[PDB]
């Protein structure tokens, strides 16, 4: 039986749109952690073969340098909104000559939420929703911001968030140890251990990835060496 | 003018069972000669040649797309092209530039290839054809070449003759143009046969 | 099943089951209640949070100084509206130079709403509004359903358990034309809260608040802005 | 050219002289300037011949179709319309100077004028054309209110032959027509027949 | 009388015994809508609606089911509200369209034919669904005369002296027949209207509801009007009265 | 160019001349100036010689089509229109000014056409360059209802006028009378005017062209 | 408002076959039947124009259309789809003309409007034409005679039959006729294998014929087809 | 086969297995769904249409209800069937009648506008997306030179000139009716013809109908502009047949 992709169930809601939202269910888990010392973002890599070389899994990308995103999903639906957001804050930046606050960036790619459709369209429009849930992580006027967007379009403020399949679970457990006074080092340490909780291998410094933007420094993507040393203190 | 920029001259002429069709050689820009072996005539079948004269680009481009829709032609339908159908193509080809037209005056001539019967013809630039019994000419020195067209044609000539009076015809016009000669070429063809000469001509 | 999945399509009984199901994407969303005196228009909005780590939905827009909206529903059908309705509004201000009124802007959504609920492939807008605003005629509250439809309301509340608030507004209706501001955003308080259990109630932290006015712009208050709003309620026990 | 159209009780009265020019030459002595656009509604062309035939051509076409699918004899004022339509959109490409003349059951005998900017106006009497600037003086001091039919008639007649005289782009014959609800009486001054005037001797 | 295998999915298909049923469906929709009346009679044309109240929560004059067409051209609707109102633009621009290309205001029987063109054209094609509303024109002029045209979701236009739309169709026809209105004038048929409205009206199944009322006609100049309060409320008190009996 | 156009008692005379000038050059000398429009529709084309061609063959075609449709006899009225439409289309881009003459159910009919699209019925037209001189004969020598013979002399006159008094025009005379029941498509008419007689004989001998390259090339 | 199918109504079977041309093609060999001749000076078309009542104009329609001077058509099959096909093929007859200003080639028009019948089926949103057709036509001094089938298929033949008892026709055709006819003859065993189907009495009005030879296409007149029904002349 | 289905070929303008178009013949039956019945005659200087004028409302304004139209001044037509596409198709025929005369210059024939109806019928007969027209036209005129012309074109896209036919429920049986009353070789006069028709009409449903419930076009050689006749006219049509 097939119907439109622009079709209401009887609860009130768009088939698509719902099964984009399982469609996330079987993504990479990632946490983000906001503080007042900067925001974090933690993802794993989940390297299926040795063969495969990890430093070319990148789950998380700089949008710009004051904001991050980490991706959970279809990656390749992720790259289209990735770019997006990279062209909407430079031509922000042109157009104003002003950074683009992450809540604007978040509901810029937001305004892509349910552009697709069958019937009366442009010949290059998209035919399904996005299967992809993002993590915006940045530094503004208004402080460090976590944004949290899913398929629907709904895009909401986070203080600690998890996306991906161990979502749940990593969820109870940041409730658990979150507190609107954390320091950056406990933000990232608590990011480690829950990740580490859900993760089905073994977590090592070529296993996940951990990046930081803090006020005074652009968005950063933790090396080899500095993973080590965080790993370190489990 | 555009047509005097490259010169250059094309003529046909009819014989008994023969026809004769014949062009200059030179490819000049304004007062500068470029080459002395430009090809103005091309075959567009057996028994059948088209003569093109004026903007050296617009010959070779009018010749190339003919070329294009003649092997089209001879590939949907099982035949070599009758000399009429050929100038209302070329005639059609030219007038769909009727508002940004190709700067060449073709001339035709050739052989019915179902019988022997000899034709000519000459176009606008825009493809308003013209059809005589006589001979056709098209190029910077027209006024010359009918000059000596009109007193050295006969009517019912043989091969031999026809090749004399087009080539003098052709050498003696030419030779009062500054932009055309640099060599005469002649493709006179009959049902059997097909000379092609180059006439002793000057270099000036 | 064969007159549910293209909006295209009657039922054998005169129905359209697309459009139907699109006004139960209202009932999804978190109540919102909007009321006017005769001076001011009010939306009064229950804010609503994923997880306790998550902020409260944002649920009240501002379209222009004396136009603003409360959402239910799909929330990216929500900002298509609310950008629609600023681009009229804008355009209405560079051409007459004069604010745009109320009930055209409303009739202008009805016309862009109604489109797509009788061409194949497309589908209706699966949001609500409550709309506040102020013109030459004063005070408004207009409510746009999924269908196209639209209401000039002396009150109303839509989304979850709604009826609550809608009987709460239905006994007070002669009251609200004479009251001042702040006994009016109160009685948008109380009809927003009774659609809670007794376990829950209001906060500086699920509650936005919206005034428009005579003497007032279109305006948003939430967090501490709301707290002298609040301060204010009877604490209504079980 | 000279074209004129006087309004009546029961109707209307047409005038036209028939010359048609290409520079000093002559291409057509005798035109035909009064265009039938239905039943009783003509129209007095100037102008380009080219534009204002196509135009008349696409107005009968328009108000014969607007006709039928009303079922109503059409409106002078409509046709007129049309014509507006068309000269004031197209003002810029058309040199067209328009007399719509006729009757209708509603609004009885009318005239009205579509010059070449493409406004339009209802009038008691117009005239238009090249020679029309010869007889303004003439038209000015001999128009009176209340005329009859004939009356309207021999004044067309009248100030045609004057226009003619003076304008070289005017001449030939004369075409008149008058229009009521009986119908249309078309008819042609030639020769004698044409208005004649004493001419200054000594 | 009820076929439905496939042969009731698109208004671009017929029924193996020659119908298409989306348009009976539409027609349907029609019907299980609240009544709307109209009658002409000799300085004019009238029109009453029974609008039904969901809510007391609703403003007075909310979802009116009485439009201004044109400045000369009333249009009463029943059936699904918002198509009403799609409609209803549609009259409006095809109106305004008609004095700028043709300098008058557009008679009644035309602006007719052509929203019914219009409504015709949806009930051919699966890309689109019929209109689910049928509606009447009102209109009047001395030229013309007073005029009053219905259009259904089929398409079809036809001219009237009365005509009733919903629920109660027929019952307010049998009430119609009984005035002899190509001789009242319209001052008198507003309180056979809302009477005829106060008697279909059913108050079991239906709750409260509100009365709309039209003039347009020579008490009007012409102009397409609402019914003055006092004169409202003269009608609907002549009616509740006229309902004891 | 000179062409003429006239209406007589059973039909219509069209008449042309045949001489096709480049600038100021004569290039032809029998040019065929009278085109076919459909059996009993006839044209004759001065102006942009491509343009009279293209449009007169156009008209032609679509008039054939119409005709197979119809399976009645093509009427002059739509020749007169798809041309003038045409060519108003154009804005007086396309030269053609023609003379369109031919027999109906409603009889015979002759209308001048202008490349900006205004056309004239007229018992008798003319156009070109030679036309005034033509235009003369007519006003000189036309009588309604003419016979035959008599219309075919007037307008070969009128033609020989433009031939004589004007440098566009020359050579001979083409004819196409056009009746209720004939077709006489007489090409030429007339040829008023011959080269004189070749006073020498110019014949080159075989070998006084001296030859640099030969190449013979045997087909089959 | 409207726009249009964009996907193929025809598609291949499992079995590799085309179903909807074959059921067009089932539409056709449901029609009243056609016979066309090839006979050496010139070309017979025939086909059973019978009414269904006294009433019908017989000579208001006709199954013998001319596409140019030199170019005649028949059809068996469904009527309107015919009556297209042959705006159509005249259209194209005159595009030839207007490029080439030679009269087109029998062979020629037949591919063209053999590529218009193709493209109905592939092309979105509709079906294949219900109609086979019979194009006579007199061109380079031979005559032609072609098929063209719903598929867009084409084939060239000396004689032939379609519509309803085709195959038998054709059998008749295979033995009652052969090559070095003259027109006449064709004309005469045209009639005679119609005559094998024609349930009824067959009279001038009861079937119509067209013939081509190098003066031109034409239909001929019911007194012809009279003198030529009285199994004589 | 003889009945045989396969896919959609009774929902969409497909073949069926055995060469049929379901939509086309259910467009024909949806002819029916009006439940009238209209006669067209054709004289020896003339051309008449009668069609059952049912209205059985005093609410409607008679004067509104009709199913003859005015195509030309001179050209008639009748429709039968569906309204609303009957009326579409009739404004479709105005529109190719005036577009024809603007294009050529002279009026359009029965012959070439039925025609032109038909292959735009056709279109419908062929293309998925949209369904037939369930309605009927049937055109009357005077031309030229072939005389008066009664035409008719269908849902299939076929079209035809006759010398009577009908259309509607009693279609059959007034083809029959008139096709008996033809082979007797009357002076087909306008009276003859007038009478013919209505009297076809009314034995098929026998009424002897009041001059209120049917209509009557009319076109003769005489006068061309076509004519819809006054109920007074109709009325002294009727009391003359029942004389005989």
Same mark, same amino acid.
């Given at each position: 039986y097939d119907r439109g992709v622009n079709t209401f169930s009887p609860e009130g809601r768009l088939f698509q749109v719902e099964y984009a939202i399982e469609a996330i269910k079987l993504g990479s888990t990632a946490i983000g952690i906001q503080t007042s010392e900067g925001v974090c973002l933690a993802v794993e890599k989940r390297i299926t073969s040795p063969l495969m070389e990890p430093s070319s899994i990148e789950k998380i990308v700089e949008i710009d340098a004051h904001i991050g995103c980490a991706m959970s999903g279809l990656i390749a639906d992720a790259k289209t909104l990735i770019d997006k957001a990279r062209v909407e804050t430079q031509n922000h930046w042109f157009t104003y000559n002003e950074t683009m606050t992450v809540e604007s960036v978040t509901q810029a790619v937001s305004n892509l939420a349910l552009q697709f459709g069958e019937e009366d369209a442009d010949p290059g429009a998209m035919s399904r929703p996005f299967g992809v849930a993002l993590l915006f992580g940045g530094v503004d006027e208004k402080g460090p911001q976590l944004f949290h967007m899913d398929p629907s379009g709904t895009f909401v403020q986070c203080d600690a968030r998890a996306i991906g399949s161990a979502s749940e679970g990593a969820q109870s457990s940041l409730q658990e140890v979150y507190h609107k006074s954390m320091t950056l080092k406990e933000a990232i340490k608590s990011s480690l251990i829950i990740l580490k909780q859900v993760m089905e291998e073994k977590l090592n410094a070529t296993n996940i990835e951990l990046a930081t933007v803090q006020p005074g420094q652009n968005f950063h993507m933790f090396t080899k060496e500095e993973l080590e040393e965080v790993i370190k203190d489990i | 003018s555009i047509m005097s920029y490259n010169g250059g001259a094309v003529m046909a002429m009819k014989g008994k069972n023969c026809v004769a069709i014949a062009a200059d050689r030179r490819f000049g820009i304004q007062a500068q000669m470029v080459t002395t072996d430009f090809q103005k005539i091309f075959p567009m079948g057996d028994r059948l040649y088209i003569g093109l004269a004026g903007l050296a680009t617009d010959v070779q481009t009018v010749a190339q797309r003919l070329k294009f829709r003649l092997n089209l032609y001879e590939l949907k339908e099982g035949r070599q092209i009758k000399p009429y159908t050929l100038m209302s193509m070329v005639a059609?080809?030219?007038?769909?530039?009727?508002?940004?037209?190709?700067?060449?005056?073709?001339?035709?001539?050739?052989?019915?290839?179902?019988?022997?019967?000899? =034709?000519?013809?000459?176009?606008?630039?825009?493809?308003?054809?013209?059809?005589?019994?006589? =001979?056709?000419? $098209?190029?910077?020195?027209?006024?010359?070449?009918?000059?000596?067209?009109? $007193?050295?044609?006969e009517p019912n000539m043989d091969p031999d003759h026809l090749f004399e009076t087009i080539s003098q015809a052709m050498l003696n016009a030419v030779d009062r143009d500054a932009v055309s000669g640099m060599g005469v070429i002649v493709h006179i063809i009959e049902k059997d046969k097909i000379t092609t000469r180059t006439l002793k001509a000057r270099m000036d | 099943n064969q007159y549910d999945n293209d909006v295209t399509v009657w039922s054998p009984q005169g129905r359209i089951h697309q459009?139907?199901?699109? %006004?139960?994407?209202?009932?999804?969303?978190?109540?919102?209640?909007?009321?006017? !005196?005769?001076?001011?228009?009010?939306?009064?909005?229950?804010?609503?949070?994923?997880?306790?780590?998550?902020?409260?939905?944002?649920?009240?827009?501002?379209?222009?100084?004396?136009?603003?909206?409360?959402?239910?529903?799909?929330?990216?059908?929500?900002?298509?509206?609310?950008?629609?309705?600023?681009?009229?509004?804008?355009?209405?201000?560079?051409?007459?130079?004069?604010?745009?009124?109320?009930?055209?802007?409303?009739?202008?959504?009805?016309?862009?709403?109604?489109?797509?609920?009788?061409?194949?492939?497309?589908?209706?807008?699966?949001?609500?509004?409550?709309?506040?605003?102020?013109?030459? %005629?004063?005070?408004?509250i207009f409510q746009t359903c999924p269908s196209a439809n639209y209401f000039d309301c002396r009150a109303m509340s839509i989304?979850?358990?709604?009826? !609550?608030?809608?009987?709460?507004?239905?006994?007070?209706?002669?009251?609200? %034309?004479?009251?001042?501001?702040?006994?009016?955003?109160?009685?948008?308080?109380?009809?927003?809260?009774?659609?809670?259990?007794?376990?829950?109630?209001?906060?500086?932290?699920?509650? !936005?608040?919206?005034?428009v006015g005579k003497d007032l712009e279109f305006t948003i208050y939430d967090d501490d802005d709301v707290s002298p709003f609040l301060e204010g309620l009877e604490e209504r026990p079980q | 050219t000279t074209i004129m159209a006087v309004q009546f009780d029961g109707g209307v009265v047409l005038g036209a002289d028939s010359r048609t020019t290409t520079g000093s030459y002559i291409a057509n002595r005798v035109t035909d300037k009064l265009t039938p656009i239905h039943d009783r509604i003509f129209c007095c062309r100037s102008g380009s011949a080219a534009d204002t035939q196509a135009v008349a051509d696409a107005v009968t076409y328009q108000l014969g179709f607007h006709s039928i699918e009303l079922n109503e004899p059409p409106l002078v004022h409509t046709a007129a319309s049309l014509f507006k339509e068309m000269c004031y959109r197209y003002r810029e490409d058309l040199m067209a100077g328009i007399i719509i003349a006729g009757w209708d059951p509603q609004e009885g005998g009318?005239?009205?004028?579509?010059?070449?900017?493409?406004?339009?106006?209802?009038?008691?009497?117009?005239?238009?054309?090249?020679?029309?600037?010869?007889?303004?003086?003439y038209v000015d001091a001999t128009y009176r209110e209340g005329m009859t039919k004939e009356e309207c008639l021999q004044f067309t007649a009248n100030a045609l032959a004057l226009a003619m005289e003076r304008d070289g782009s005017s001449g030939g014959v004369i075409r008149l027509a008058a229009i009521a609800e009986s119908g249309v009486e078309r008819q042609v001054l030639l020769g004698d027949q044409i208005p004649k005037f004493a001419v200054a001797t000594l | 009388s009820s076929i439905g295998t496939g042969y009731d999915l698109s208004a671009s298909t017929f029924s193996p015994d020659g119908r298409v049923f989306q348009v009976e469906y539409a027609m349907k929709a029609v019907e299980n809508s609240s009544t709307a009346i109209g009658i002409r009679c000799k300085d004019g044309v009238v029109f009453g609606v029974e609008k039904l109240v969901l809510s007391k929560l609703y403003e007075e004059g909310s979802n009116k089911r009485l439009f201004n067409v044109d400045r000369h051209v009333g249009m009463a609707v029943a059936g699904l509200l918002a198509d009403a109102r799609s409609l209803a633009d549609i009259a409006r621009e095809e109106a305004s369209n008609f004095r700028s290309n043709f300098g008058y205001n557009i008679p009644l029987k035309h602006l007719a034919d052509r929203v019914a063109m219009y409504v015709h054209a949806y009930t051919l094609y699966s890309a689109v669904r019929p209109f689910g509303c049928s509606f009447m024109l009102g209109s009047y002029s001395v030229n013309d005369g007073a005029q009053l045209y219905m259009i259904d979701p089929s398409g079809v236009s036809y001219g009237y002296w009365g005509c009733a739309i919903g629920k109660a169709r027929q019952a307010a026809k049998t009430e119609i027949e009984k005035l002899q209105m190509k001789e009242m004038?319209?001052?008198?048929?507003?309180?056979?209207?809302?009477?005829?409205?106060?008697?279909?009206?059913?108050?079991?199944?239906?709750?409260?509801?509100?009365?709309?009322?039209?003039?347009?006609?020579?008490?009007?100049n012409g102009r397409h009007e609402i019914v003055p309060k006092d004169i409202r409320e003269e009608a609907e008190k002549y009616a509740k009265e006229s309902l004891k009996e | 160019t000179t062409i003429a156009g006239v209406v007589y008692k059973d039909g219509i005379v069209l008449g042309a001349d045949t001489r096709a000038t480049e600038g100021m050059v004569v290039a032809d000398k029998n040019c065929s100036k009278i085109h076919f429009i459909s059996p009993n529709i006839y044209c004759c084309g001065a102006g942009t010689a491509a343009d009279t061609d293209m449009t007169t063959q156009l008209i032609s075609s679509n008039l054939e089509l119409h005709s197979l449709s119809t399976g009645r006899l093509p009427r002059v009225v739509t020749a007169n229109r798809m041309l003038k439409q045409m060519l108003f289309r154009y804005q007086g881009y396309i030269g053609a000014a023609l003379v369109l003459g031919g027999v109906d159910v409603t009889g015979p009919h002759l209308y001048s056409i202008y490349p900006h699209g205004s056309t004239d019925k007229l018992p008798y037209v003319t156009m070109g360059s030679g036309s005034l001189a033509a235009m003369a004969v007519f006003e000189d020598k036309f009588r309604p209802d003419m016979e035959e013979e008599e219309a075919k002399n007037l307008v070969s006159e009128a033609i020989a006028a433009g031939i004589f008094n004007d440098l566009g025009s020359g050579s001979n005379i083409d004819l196409c009378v056009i009746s209720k029941n004939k077709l006489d498509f007489l090409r030429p008419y007339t040829v008023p005017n011959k080269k004189g007689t070749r006073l020498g004989r110019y014949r080159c001998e075989k070998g006084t062209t001296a030859v640099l390259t030969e190449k013979i090339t045997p087909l089959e | 408002a409207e726009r249009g199918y964009s996907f193929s109504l025809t598609t291949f079977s499992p079995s590799g076959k085309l179903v909807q041309i074959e059921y067009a093609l089932a539409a056709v060999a449901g029609g009243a039947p056609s016979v066309g001749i090839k006979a050496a000076n010139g070309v017979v078309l025939a086909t059973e124009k019978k009414q269904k009542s006294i009433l019908y104009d017989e000579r208001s329609v006709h199954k013998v259309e001319p596409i140019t001077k030199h170019i005649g058509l028949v059809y068996s099959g469904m009527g309107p789809d015919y009556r297209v096909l042959v705006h159509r093929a005249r259209k194209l007859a005159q595009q030839y003309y207007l490029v080439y200003q030679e009269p087109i080639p029998t062979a020629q028009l037949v591919q063209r409007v053999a590529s218009v019948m193709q493209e109905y089926t592939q092309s979105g949103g509709v079906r294949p034409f219900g109609v086979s057709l019979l194009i006579c036509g007199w061109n380079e001094g031979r005559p032609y005679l072609f098929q063209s089938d719903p598929s867009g298929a084409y084939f060239a033949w000396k004689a032939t039959a379609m519509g309803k008892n085709y195959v038998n026709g054709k059998t008749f055709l295979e033995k009652r006729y052969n090559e070095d006819l003259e027109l006449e003859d064709a004309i005469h065993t045209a009639i005679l294998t119609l005559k094998e189907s024609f349930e009824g009495q067959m009279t001038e009005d009861n079937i119509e014929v067209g013939i081509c030879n190098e003066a031109g296409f034409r239909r001929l007149t019911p007194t012809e087809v009279k003198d030529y029904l009285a199994a004589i002349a | 086969s003889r009945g045989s289905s396969a896919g959609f070929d009774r929902h969409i303008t497909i073949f069926s297995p055995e060469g049929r178009l379901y939509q086309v013949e259910y467009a024909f039956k949806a002819i029916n769904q009006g439940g009238l019945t209209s006669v067209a005659v054709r004289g020896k200087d003339c051309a008449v249409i009668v069609t059952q004028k049912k209205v059985p409302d005093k609410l409607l304004d008679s004067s509104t209800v009709t199913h003859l139209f005015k195509i030309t001044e001179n050209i008639g037509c009748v429709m039968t069937g569906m309204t609303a596409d009957s009326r579409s198709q009739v404004q479709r025929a105005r529109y190719e009648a005036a577009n024809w005369k603007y294009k050529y210059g002279y009026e359009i024939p029965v012959d070439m506008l039925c025609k032109r109806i038909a292959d735009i019928s056709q279109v419908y007969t062929q293309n998925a997306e949209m369904r037939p027209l369930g309605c009927c036209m049937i055109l009357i005129g005077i031309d030229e030179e072939q005389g008066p012309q009664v035409y008719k074109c269908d849902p299939a896209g076929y079209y035809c000139g006759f010398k009577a036919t009908a259309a509607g429920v009693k279609q059959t049986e007034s083809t029959s009716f008139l096709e008996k009353k033809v082979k007797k070789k009357f002076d087909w006069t306008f009276?003859?013809?007038?009478?013919?028709?209505?009297?076809?009409?009314?034995?098929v449903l026998s009424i002897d109908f009041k001059p209120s419930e049917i209509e009557v076009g009319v076109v003769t050689v005489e006068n061309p502009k076509f004519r819809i006749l006054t109920e007074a006219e109709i009325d002294a049509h009727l009391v003359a047949l029942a004389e005989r």
């Open positions: - | 059609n080809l030219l007038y769909e530039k009727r508002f940004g037209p190709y700067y060449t005056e073709p001339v035709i001539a050739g052989l019915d290839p179902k019988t022997f019967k000899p =034709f000519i013809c000459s176009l606008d630039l825009i493809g308003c054809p013209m059809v005589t019994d006589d =001979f056709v000419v $098209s190029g910077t020195c027209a006024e010359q070449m009918y000059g000596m067209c009109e $007193s050295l044609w | 459009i139907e199901y699109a %006004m139960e994407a209202v009932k999804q969303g978190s109540a919102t209640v909007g009321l006017k !005196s005769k001076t001011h228009a009010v939306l009064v909005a229950l804010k609503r949070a994923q997880s306790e780590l998550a902020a409260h939905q944002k649920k009240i827009l501002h379209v222009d100084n004396h136009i603003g909206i409360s959402i239910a529903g799909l929330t990216a059908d929500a900002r298509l509206l609310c950008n629609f309705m600023r681009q009229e509004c804008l355009d209405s201000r560079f051409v007459f130079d004069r604010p745009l009124p109320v009930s055209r802007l409303v009739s202008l959504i009805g016309s862009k709403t109604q489109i797509p609920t009788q061409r194949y492939g497309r589908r209706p807008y699966g949001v609500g509004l409550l709309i506040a605003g102020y013109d030459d %005629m004063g005070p408004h989304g979850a358990r709604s009826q !609550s608030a809608r009987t709460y507004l239905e006994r007070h209706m002669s009251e609200f %034309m004479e009251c001042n501001l702040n006994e009016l955003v109160k009685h948008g308080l109380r009809a927003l809260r009774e659609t809670l259990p007794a376990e829950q109630d209001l906060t500086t932290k699920n509650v !936005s608040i919206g005034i | 009318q005239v009205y004028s579509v010059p070449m900017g493409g406004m339009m106006v209802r009038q008691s009497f117009a005239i238009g054309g090249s020679g029309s600037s010869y007889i303004y003086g | 004038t319209c001052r008198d048929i507003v309180k056979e209207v809302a009477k005829i409205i106060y008697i279909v009206h059913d108050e079991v199944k239906d709750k409260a509801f509100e009365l709309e009322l039209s003039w347009v006609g020579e008490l009007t | - | - | 009276e003859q013809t007038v009478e013919t028709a209505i009297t076809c009409l009314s034995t």
